[PDB]
């Protein structure tokens, strides 16, 4: 299934993105990934339509709270990338 | 679903002061702190919407005199149980 | 009991703050915390009077070594010391 | 075998680089490394031709998501893959 | 107790040079390096006050020719057990 | 034996420095050290001449990939290489 990502500088904006994503569409919250330097990536899974709507809503909600650094949807991930995603 | 409140600061002393100011009222529960690097610390609380709004306002007011406030936000009705919504 | 904090930019100023605090008053060193951006917090505990004298001395000594970002005393922490402090 | 690297500022661009690298050629994803300043390196291994094609595709895909800081191929690593790579991949 | 000497750099190469110059200049024991992130590294030495003052001065002078020195300090007489003021790791 | 260091901003630059350094038989790769702020140090050992040529080659290869932050050779390290180097 499709992968959706919203990356912020600041955790409060990432929490807000996570909540707005799960509220807006039928997506599963995979989790948060912290890479340091204040950067937090919120990851969601679901059908491509649901993931596109959820990432759009999560990015729009996060921008009202803090800094959004990246927003992206991978409609059909290659099976080899599940290895680098947070459990 | 009880409300979630966040006060995110640059500086730990500012975050501890925000935590202490927030828990100073009986109906506000401290969930914990989260560190993400770049000196950013988030203090997370839970309780009734009104109690969380008053707590985050008080937490940000206390933190700003010690360090910098980066974010202040209340989620009145978090989706799922707060545990799924919150980082590990 | 009271909590005292001296937060510096860099570790050297923080170690000097820790030593000046224990030299000046009857306080216990809880530890050092790191949060990134070179920020280090030295945390002490004891009676309010001792913590006020220690933090004042700690900040004064640290300023001669590096940058002091914050100095603060919480006379009566509103929850358990272990619960108000980060893990 | 050849080593391929795509280093981005931010994780989202790195995940996109990883996905595009494995989709574009017969390469194995070794993993990702974090070094601070928001820098994330995605590392692949395989035949030189496959690694060159994969890194080119990974960098092109990552640039549409975020900032690409470095793209590089080591065709024949001098010491064993595990030796020249840092411990936690 | 024994004196503590510290040289804090931004960059590990300057810290290694400080550590080598500190142990070469006087009868001091290298305690170790402390990394706090943000590229900051503190080199800590222990020994007699005179030896520590000479060693820290030499360590800072040598490190400045390699990279950035952020702090230089000597604690002549620690006011509690050295294990209590030194960070855990 | 001598110690050589090439410190870069960027891991790709550090891996390229490491590969260039070990491209000659009498240079041993000790390892990498990360300290945050994107700074990575590649450490080598061997005869002073081999280490000087290795660090010069490591810095030259790394600079075309990312930034070189430090390049240094210690011809005669005091104590053994392990007592002067950080734990990891």
Query: Which of chain C's residues have a Cβ under 8 Å away from the Cβ of A37?
Result: 36
Among chain E residues, CA nearest to D37: E38
Q: How close does chain B come to C33, measured CA to CA in Å?
A: 8
Are C32 and E87 a contacting pair, CB within 8 Å? yes
Where is F9: in which H helix or E strand? strand F2-9
Residue F55 has which token pair?
């660090």
Interchain contact, E35 vs F36, CB within 8 Å: yes
Interchain contact, E40 vs C37, CB within 8 Å: no
Cα angle B44, B47, B51; round to 5: 100
Query: Which of chain E's residues have a Cβ under 8 Å away from the Cβ of C13?
Result: 71, 73
Are C42 and C29 a contacting pair, CB within 8 Å? yes
Which among B70, B64, B63, B62 has a CA at the least distance from the CA of B37? B70
**Could you say which of E6, E37, E86 has the minimum Cβ distance to residue C12?**
E6
Are D37 and A37 a contacting pair, CB within 8 Å? yes
Are A75 and A57 a contacting pair, CB within 8 Å? no
Count of all residues that appear for chain B in the document = 88
Tokens 């996109």 locate to D16
Phi, psi of E3, rounded to the nearest 5 degrees: -70, 155
C-alpha span between C36 and A40 (Å, rounded): 15
C-alpha span between F44 and B49 (Å, rounded): 59
C-alpha span between F2 and C36 (Å, rounded): 33
Question: What CATH number has the domain bearing residue D50?
Answer: 3.30.70.1710
Domain assignment of residue B56, given as a range: 1-88
**Could you say which of E38, E72, E79 has the minimum Cβ distance to residue C22?**
E79
Residue ranges of F 2-21 with Cβ closer than 8 A to chain E:
3, 5, 7
Answer whether A71 touches D (CB < 8 Å). yes
Q: Which chains touch F (3 or more CB pairs under 8 A)?
A: D, E
Which among F52, F49, F60, F47 has a CA at the least distance from the CA of F20? F60
Work out how many domains chain A is built from and give that number: 1
| Pairs of CB atoms within 8 A across D/E | 3
What distances in angstroms separate CA C2 from CA B40, C22, C30, C43, one per listed residue?
A: 24, 15, 12, 10
Answer whether E89 touches C (CB < 8 Å). no
Rg (CA), chain B: 12
What distances in angstroms separate CA E16 from CA D8, F7, F13, F71, F81, one per listed residue?
A: 29, 12, 20, 12, 11
Are B30 and B24 a contacting pair, CB within 8 Å? no
C-alpha span between E42 and E86 (Å, rounded): 11
Query: Which of chain F's residues have a Cβ under 8 Å away from the Cβ of E38?
Result: 36-37
Instruction: Name the region of D4 (left: φ>0; alpha: ψ -120 to 50; beta: rest).
Output: beta
Q: How close does chain C come to A49, measured CA to CA in Å?
A: 38
Interchain contact, E4 vs C15, CB within 8 Å: yes
CA dihedral F24, F27, F28, F32 (to 10 degrees): -90
Are D40 and D83 a contacting pair, CB within 8 Å? no
Are F59 and F71 a contacting pair, CB within 8 Å? yes
CB atoms near residue C31 (< 10 Å): 13
Q: How close does chain C come to E12, measured CA to CA in Å?
A: 15
What is the maximum span of chain D, computed from C-alpha positions, in angstroms? 34
Task: Count the helix, strand and coil residues of chain A and give each as a percent rounded to the nearest 5.
Answer: 40, 40, 25
E-strand spans in F10-66? 27-36, 39-46
Are C12 and C66 a contacting pair, CB within 8 Å? yes
């Amino acid at each position: 299934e499709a992968l959706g990502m919203v990356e912020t500088k600041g955790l409060t904006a990432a929490i807000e993105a996570a909540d707005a994503m799960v509220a807006s569409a039928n997506v599963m919250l995979v989790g948060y990934e912290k890479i340091g330097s204040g950067l937090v990536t919120v990851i969601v899974r679901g059908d491509v339509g649901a993931v596109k709507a959820a990432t759009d809503a999560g990015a729009a909600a996060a921008r009202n709270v803090g800094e959004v650094k990246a927003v992206h949807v991978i409609p059909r991930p290659h099976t080899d990338v599940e290895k680098i995603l947070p459990k």
